[PDB]
Design an enzyme around this catalytic site. Structure first.
Site, mmCIF file in Angstrom:
data_model
loop_
_atom_site.group_PDB
_atom_site.id
_atom_site.type_symbol
_atom_site.label_atom_id
_atom_site.label_comp_id
_atom_site.label_asym_id
_atom_site.label_seq_id
_atom_site.Cartn_x
_atom_site.Cartn_y
_atom_site.Cartn_z
ATOM 1 N N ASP A 50 26.023 69.942 28.545
ATOM 2 C CA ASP A 50 24.754 69.231 28.556
ATOM 3 C C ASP A 50 24.318 69.071 30.012
ATOM 4 O OD1 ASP A 50 22.603 67.464 28.393
ATOM 5 O OD2 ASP A 50 23.508 66.227 26.813
ATOM 6 N N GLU A 91 30.103 56.969 31.174
ATOM 7 C CA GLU A 91 29.163 57.553 30.226
ATOM 8 C C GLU A 91 29.577 56.987 28.867
ATOM 9 O OE1 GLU A 91 28.053 58.989 27.279
ATOM 10 O OE2 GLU A 91 29.072 60.903 27.729
ATOM 11 N N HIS A 106 22.464 66.522 24.301
ATOM 12 C CA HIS A 106 23.373 66.620 23.171
ATOM 13 C C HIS A 106 23.388 65.362 22.316
ATOM 14 C CE1 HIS A 106 26.087 64.150 25.568
ATOM 15 N NE2 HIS A 106 26.910 64.083 24.536
HETATM 16 C C1 XJ4 Z 1 30.856 58.229 25.062
HETATM 17 N N1 XJ4 Z 1 30.015 59.380 25.359
HETATM 18 C C2 XJ4 Z 1 29.922 60.250 24.193
HETATM 19 C C3 XJ4 Z 1 28.785 61.253 24.386
HETATM 20 N N2 XJ4 Z 1 28.618 62.087 23.207
HETATM 21 C C4 XJ4 Z 1 27.991 61.304 22.153
HETATM 22 C C5 XJ4 Z 1 27.742 62.190 20.928
HETATM 23 C C6 XJ4 Z 1 26.569 62.922 20.800
HETATM 24 C C7 XJ4 Z 1 26.360 63.734 19.687
HETATM 25 C C8 XJ4 Z 1 27.328 63.820 18.697
HETATM 26 C C9 XJ4 Z 1 28.497 63.087 18.838
HETATM 27 C C10 XJ4 Z 1 29.595 63.123 17.778
HETATM 28 N N3 XJ4 Z 1 29.905 64.236 17.156
HETATM 29 C C11 XJ4 Z 1 30.863 64.248 16.245
HETATM 30 N N4 XJ4 Z 1 31.258 65.448 15.526
HETATM 31 C C12 XJ4 Z 1 30.448 66.649 15.438
HETATM 32 C C13 XJ4 Z 1 29.064 66.591 15.543
HETATM 33 C C14 XJ4 Z 1 28.316 67.758 15.452
HETATM 34 C C15 XJ4 Z 1 28.960 68.976 15.243
HETATM 35 C C16 XJ4 Z 1 30.341 69.030 15.124
HETATM 36 C C17 XJ4 Z 1 31.087 67.866 15.217
HETATM 37 C C18 XJ4 Z 1 31.530 63.071 15.970
HETATM 38 C C19 XJ4 Z 1 32.635 63.110 14.921
HETATM 39 C C20 XJ4 Z 1 31.174 61.905 16.649
HETATM 40 C C21 XJ4 Z 1 31.818 60.530 16.440
HETATM 41 C C22 XJ4 Z 1 32.562 59.825 17.398
HETATM 42 C C23 XJ4 Z 1 32.902 60.309 18.801
HETATM 43 N N5 XJ4 Z 1 32.928 58.662 16.831
HETATM 44 O O1 XJ4 Z 1 32.408 58.634 15.563
HETATM 45 C C24 XJ4 Z 1 31.737 59.740 15.312
HETATM 46 C C25 XJ4 Z 1 31.035 60.091 14.008
HETATM 47 N N6 XJ4 Z 1 30.208 61.986 17.544
HETATM 48 C C26 XJ4 Z 1 28.711 62.278 19.939
#
Ligand code: XJ4
Length: 333
Positions: free
Chosen positions: A22, A114, A271
């Site tokens: 990102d 972050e 993202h």
């Molecule tokens: C603390 N800075 C984090 C910055 N990134 C935030 C962010 C932005 C966009 C998406 C997620 C995300 N993707 C997940 N899988 C996934 C998504 C799409 C495709 C394939 C797999 C999960 C499982 C989670 C999650 C978390 C961690 N805890 O619970 C959950 C629910 N979060 C996280």
């Protein structure tokens, strides 16, 4: 238990890479830190949830004297390798464990992190960030300093209809001879409980956003257990309101300048995408109507929030609720 999975998720270099790639995220953090070099030159800095350590290196490129990088996942072993191979074992110290449990040897001048989940609040890492202020010297800074949540009513009939279309799988009196139809309402319910994570055309928005601000310098950890966001929208367009859209901005308020990181739908995609919560039943609103209600976020034990949204069109009294499980969204992208 649920937290076991949370920290294992972040033990994957591929998850670190998704965030690193990102460019809006990573580049904005670099610019916020570098262009505020006076906040970092010769300072002591704490990196909360450093993951691969990329933020800790940016603070070193800015001149910091000592950097404590705290990381609870197995990723801490990978950041250690990176610190050695980049020859920074003098300036960066990786500390394995949660920020709530580790022992730091001194107080720090600035905390960097972050900690934003999708819809900002998912993961409840903002609380770990706020908890870390127990190491912040008086008159220390936080990077990021401010977070703004925005919400706005939207109309998106195709998104709404997509829900009953998926749940109508269950409305078959003879699926291989079996009547499934008594589960249709449970299946509807399950789809409406999911926030929809993806981006959207800003022409679905029907009113100027409402802004709810968290000041990281001022907030306490307990303040995030329950987040009441009242709203009153003056509707700029008529249409069926299908729910509320959410995005967030954060601000790094440095001595030299303020740098913003935005996930707004009017800004280059990140993202984090954006998040939409559908209403049970849509609300009819004329342009000029006001749509009032409350978005209540209740911390839960799955590192996330239960979301309660109640809304009404004041001019007619038609109201809708919904209850959503932020931990289990639909990643529609
Ligand atoms: C603390 N800075 C984090 C910055 N990134 C935030 C962010 C932005 C966009 C998406 C997620 C995300 N993707 C997940 N899988 C996934 C998504 C799409 C495709 C394939 C797999 C999960 C499982 C989670 C999650 C978390 C961690 N805890 O619970 C959950 C629910 N979060 C996280």
């Amino acid at each position: 238990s649920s937290a076991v999975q949370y920290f294992q998720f972040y033990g994957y270099l591929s998850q670190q890479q998704n965030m690193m790639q990102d460019y809006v995220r990573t580049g904005t953090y670099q610019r916020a830190i570098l262009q505020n070099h006076t906040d970092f030159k010769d300072k002591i800095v704490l990196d909360v949830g450093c993951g691969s350590g990329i933020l800790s290196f940016f603070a070193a490129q800015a001149g910091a004297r000592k950097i404590y990088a705290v990381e609870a996942s197995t990723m801490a072993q990978h950041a250690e390798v990176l610190v050695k191979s980049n020859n920074l074992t003098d300036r960066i110290v990786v500390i394995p464990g949660k920020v709530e449990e580790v022992s730091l040897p001194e107080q720090v001048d600035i905390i960097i992190s972050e900690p934003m989940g999708y819809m900002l609040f998912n993961e409840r890492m903002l609380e770990s960030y706020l908890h870390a202020k127990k190491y912040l010297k008086p008159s220390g800074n936080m990077f990021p300093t401010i977070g703004d949540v925005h919400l706005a009513p939207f109309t998106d009939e195709q998104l709404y209809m997509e829900q009953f279309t998926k749940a109508n799988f269950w409305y078959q009196p003879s699926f291989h001879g079996v009547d499934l139809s008594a589960l249709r309402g449970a299946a509807v319910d399950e789809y409406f409980r999911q926030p929809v994570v993806d981006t959207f055309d800003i022409r679905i928005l029907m009113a100027k956003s409402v802004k709810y601000t968290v000041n990281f310098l001022e907030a306490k950890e307990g303040d995030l257990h329950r987040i009441e966001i009242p709203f009153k929208f003056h509707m700029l367009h008529s249409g069926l309101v299908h729910g509320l859209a959410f995005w967030f901005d954060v601000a790094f308020i440095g001595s030299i300048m303020t740098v913003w990181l935005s996930t707004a739908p009017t800004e280059p995609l990140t993202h984090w995408y954006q998040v939409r919560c559908l209403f049970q039943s849509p609300l009819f609103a004329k342009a000029g109507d006001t749509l009032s209600g409350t978005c209540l976020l209740i911390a839960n034990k799955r590192q996330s929030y239960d979301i309660s949204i109640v809304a009404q069109v004041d001019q007619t009294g038609s109201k809708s609720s919904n209850l959503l499980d932020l931990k289990n969204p639909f990643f529609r992208y």
